[PDB]
Design a protein around this ligand. Structure first.
Ligand code: COA
Ligand code: COA
Ligand code: COA
Ligand code: COA
Ligand code: COA
Ligand code: COA
Lengths: 244, 244, 244, 243, 243, 243
């Protein structure tokens, strides 16, 4: 297939304009190693230029979505660590959150802290009732890494954010949905199907418009109303120009 | 009556200190034309100085609240367009959001993107279970206009905001309420009544205080705690001075 | 006991690493007088250095949590008033909100505006179904004082925030929970018990980590994603250093 | 003339694309009254749509630019929320991000409230002879409207706070040292230097010049990382508006 | 005297409304120790409520302003969260938005941590002879507390970063070029120039001067559009607090 | 040599810890093309991990620093989202908060897009002879990428807007007046002055210097009250990374 064999820790399947992306260390519950961070940068930069990819789905192999950063690795370690950090950032949110194409997280199982940044950076998100979530950094004796805290701060109310961050307790899919972490939670049985219907629906939209709408909305969150009058019109006009 | 005949696209009725404002193009589902934007600036500046107006209700004629910006008009078109944009801003949020008197949106039917700015800029909002809402800019092939995105970003969680913005799907009143877009949703039958009870309740309050409370709260959202200690006390003291 | 007799308006009990703090003017429904503000600064600075205190609970004597600022006192009054204001700030949020140790509000009864700042500045919060809440500043003819508005703006959606601020209406514990003001609401009967279980659970955590996690999360709310990559890593590294 | 007789407190002479706008209450040192505020809103809004108007220059009749807001009026409610708003509407809400280039030509006394539209103008030329101060403090009031912020955005905080705190005056040469103006030239050559520059700005594609100047001013409020998005959005917006 | 003997590391002479506040460990070049921090909090809090105190001047005993934080102490936990907080409490949390005007009178060496309360003061006068540097870098540590931000807010980033990165020193004349002070005058006339100015600030309505200076400093953090609300709120607040 | 032949548009000579980095299309006045962008990303990323590299200097081959972005290319979509991103990636995303000290050594013409990596460098030395302008306006486009913001962060808004609006050029002496560089010295002594300073920066603990310079730059975006948390977090972070 188009990309079969291109990466060791990640696989990509194109189907009807959908680039399904699977994180591919099922035996390590798809933990995010530096290898996998470097490959995921490449996968995103590659799919950005591939005109057969209209929408991405992010998912994980086996029963993990991801189980967070690769533990048995941080233990290892240092100007190198600077660049290891940047390459986690590069794919998890620097590219993904304001991606030029629509993104959806399809959360099939374990999502554990670290995995929350790229979850939140996806435009939308469906999970399984049977998925299981955790900000268990605290039990391993660290505070959430990367933009995990910020992912939560934009998404979950602080009463609920701080409980889960400070206690380390797990929560099920239904609960991720109550808290507004995902758009919805459906039986695993119906997950891939439901995600796909949505994926197809977004392919129906003018993709230069959808970009400006979705990526303009995200940035407008950080600006004042009076600043946004100017920003969001500049993005409306930009959209007009890049379409014709 | 006091203001009967003063505007072509908007009507105003005073009753017990309540300025009921009706957008008045029912045959165009109260779309917001430049004419109607210019008149609504005037209506707000006029009602600001009218001491018989203690609280405003914003509502629309017939079965529309508003159906958003006037389509068959944007198609038309350009230094003019600059000023057409400003005059939409002037009434929809520049005057309305930090209005000197309490404001309530009474959403009786269709509310479609564009109509969301002045909906959110109103201090409070009641809708009918039977009203119907949409950010269908995307199906017409544009991103939300004016401060629509920002209206949503301050009001609805991003999972839900982006679904509705990116898909274009409609939602009913009950759902606007779940998402915190309105204070509540009641049968159309009871709407005008329920709105009025609330309107009367706000008339009971010292209006220089209510201003400082409501308009100070809105602005405090953009400031840090440490900045707000100084801002909100300056607004408390201001309130004291402008009252006696 | 360790601190018996140290303050006139506040009492402190240590038990299993928990500093239970009781506001202690039950006959004035624990209103917050300048005396009580000065003592609460001292109580927080004192408990910060006491290594037998791992977590704080904030609660009030009798049937009040607090009934807000001391009315019969503001009536009294002025460069003095400057310093009276600062000392309310000092304990209610300047020290409490980014406190070095975990904090929990245990809301046993009346909480009325003013009491909302230190409620929200606590990391977490449990209330009784039978507690009763109000932003009734408006009926007394003032806008919320201190950081009350801001407390609400960070916690409750604006539809709901502004209703309660502008109307002055009361709400019960169950409702504080719906609005995300508290983590949960339980019968008064089970309150002290439920709070304690949680308090013990947080004592199990590395306290230099918990600090950086909880106090880093709060501050990340005010920063952009790109700013937070640098901030939250600096806080991760800080945490590493202050632990060993 | 086009505009001759249209405004009681303001006078507007079009000449070679330039729109010379003269504050016209010299009997009051052009003090900024509620009347002069409303008219100025109109003037700006009229000149925005006048295609014979490429640049604006703002200057004062006589030996006065303006001596600030009208003290006689100050003296005394909801009506005050409007008069403030009208002061703002022209002195910076419209002026600072105006659709066309703007220059302040400061011929004489510029005190207090006058600093806002001074700063709000894209560029500014004064006279060696012109004299400024922030006298609000001597009148027993703190700088009003956006004056403080005008100062904060352009003058170093040590110098800013000397003049706000003492209310001492300064002349055109000091104005230039501080960064409050582009240059200070003898009153003699002031109209000439302003005209030269105004002519230069007319050479430029008007839509581009808009994006350039109005994008730069906003870009101060934004971080680099936010600005990558904003300024590129203004680039494309600029391209879209050309024909 | 009123305050004579009240503080071990600080000395406070009231004279004609002026409150001369002297950092008083000249044997240590007035190095800012945890003791001197706690006392300074008290001093500021005491002088806030003293109605005979209209202005403050902050200066150092001997030939030293301060040579920064106390290196002997630095050397070594939760207690560190307090000592930092106390350093902050006086050097800017209270000082920078102090209820009364504040002037730094810089008589001698001013290094490192000393720059925060330098900047935090509304105004500042130094001596030609006084010498400054940001030597933290030579000690193998980056500027501490709010030092960086002191520099960011007042000195251009090229100059700011030369001195933070190299740790080179500079004298009073350079200080003034950069905008770090209001002026640099021979040590001879330093006490005189400071007194003159201090006297001028006493002429002013105290409540108004507060609103004016403390509003200006905050207005830097805000946009124009936000500032319309903030500064008018400080205007009215100012009016309300007068009698 | 280590890097000799590794890059087609850029040349990198290591000498005594210093990493002289030369933009190397002198036939095009080192115009910044998509090729030179990609290579520059690589160069920076390579030099970050090279332990023989302590400082960087960025300079241009011939009598040109760079004359900005490559106009021949500009001319013509999703691919444009990448080429912009690559321009950004090196000119400020990596450079401005680079792990090692950075100096711009400006030997010749510096126009337009070149101002971003100019500003983004921690420090900068130019030649009396070198010539700059913001000519985008004459080309019928507004400053691109982060140029505006480069200017907003370092040059006073009056001067910033003169040069953005008119597109007039200026020489090395003006550059220094405005705060765009640290100094302007005869081309003759330029390499010497740059080397001296570069040598000085190598004296410093590298990890500390990082925290110091990169903390200072970020601290501009933050308020004092936020900065108390941020900068102390960078202090401790700095201590943690030393051995
Ligand atoms: C996800 C989880 C529940 C899986 O449970 P499970 O189905 O029983 O699978 P196991 O726990 O047996 O782990 C299976 C393998 O995955 C590995 N693994 C799981 N999470 C991992 C991580 N974050 N890093 C590295 N390896 C991981 C285990 O080491 C184990 O390796 P091995 O059996 O090949 O030696 C569990 O691994 C877990 O709780 N991880 C928590 C991660 C976390 O919170 N990290 C901090 C976030 S940044
Ligand atoms: C509101 C709506 C559902 C009404 O349905 P309806 O009750 O069947 O009424 P119709 O759709 O028949 O439209 C009735 C009239 O209203 C007009 N109208 C409705 N919305 C309008 C708009 N935004 N601008 C201009 N005219 C509009 C139609 O042109 C039609 O005109 P005509 O019959 O006089 O020729 C439908 O008009 C609509 O979906 N509009 C969407 C607007 C939108 O999303 N705009 C972008 C937002 S800024
Ligand atoms: C809390 C409350 C419901 C208690 O009701 P209750 O159980 O009947 O008790 P009472 O109302 O009889 O008040 C009991 C005593 O508490 C005092 N008290 C209550 N709230 C107080 C306050 N905020 N300040 C000072 N005293 C207060 C009353 O003066 C009364 O004093 P006294 O009986 O010793 O003369 C009622 O006191 C109240 O509504 N306070 C509102 C406070 C408020 O909204 N303040 C603005 C917030 S900053
Ligand atoms: C500008 C100034 C130096 C002019 O010098 P001058 O030649 O002496 O002229 P005068 O002001 O003495 O007199 C001319 C007229 O201008 C009027 N005027 C001047 N400034 C004014 C102001 N700010 N508001 C209202 N009227 C003003 C005077 O009332 C006087 O009118 P009158 O003759 O009807 O009484 C001096 O008027 C001045 O500084 N005034 C303003 C003080 C100020 O800065 N206020 C700040 C508040 S924002
Ligand atoms: C200010 C300075 C030039 C004074 O010149 P000097 O006349 O040579 O005086 P010296 O410092 O040599 O000696 C005077 C005393 O002041 C003390 N001192 C000076 N600066 C100090 C500081 N920052 N912390 C603690 N003690 C200090 C010395 O330890 C010495 O005490 P001792 O005599 O008990 O050993 C020089 O002391 C200096 O630069 N010191 C501080 C270095 C610095 O800037 N540190 C920055 C960290 S924020
Ligand atoms: C820098 C400058 C003064 C050099 O003076 P010069 O000695 O006359 O050199 P010239 O530019 O005339 O010619 C040298 C070559 O450099 C090329 N060049 C110069 N600037 C360039 C740019 N910005 N983009 C692409 N190519 C450029 C020319 O096309 C020419 O190539 P050619 O000989 O293959 O046609 C002048 O080239 C200049 O200002 N150019 C750029 C204009 C600009 O600032 N654009 C801003 C857009 S960001």
């Amino acid at each position: 297939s188009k990309y079969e064999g291109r990466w060791t820790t990640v696989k990509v399947e194109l189907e009807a304009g959908i680039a399904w992306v699977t994180l591919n260390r099922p035996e390590k519950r798809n933990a995010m190693s530096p290898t996998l961070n470097r490959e995921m940068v490449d996968v995103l930069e590659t799919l950005e230029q591939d005109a057969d990819a209209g929408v991405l789905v992010l998912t994980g192999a086996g029963e993990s979505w991801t189980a967070g950063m690769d533990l048995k690795e941080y233990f290892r370690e240092e100007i190198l660590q600077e660049k290891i950090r940047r390459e986690a950032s590069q794919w998890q949110w620097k590219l993904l959150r304001l991606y030029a194409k629509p993104t959806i997280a399809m959360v099939n199982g374990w999502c554990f802290g670290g995995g929350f940044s790229p979850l939140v950076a996806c435009d939308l998100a469906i999970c399984a009732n049977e998925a299981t979530f955790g900000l268990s950094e605290i039990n391993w004796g660290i505070p959430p890494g990367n933009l995990v805290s910020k992912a939560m701060a934009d998404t979950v109310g602080h009463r609920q954010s701080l409980y889960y961050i400070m206690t380390g307790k797990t929560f099920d899919g239904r609960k991720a949905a109550e808290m507004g972490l995902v758009n919805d939670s459906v039986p695993l049985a119906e997950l891939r199907e439901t995600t796909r219907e949505l994926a197809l629906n977004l392919l129906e939209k003018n993709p230069v418009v959808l970009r400006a709408a979705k990526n303009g909305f995200k940035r407008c969150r950080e600006l004042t109303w009076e600043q946004n009058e100017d920003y969001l019109y500049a993005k409306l006009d930009q959209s007009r120009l890049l379409d014709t």
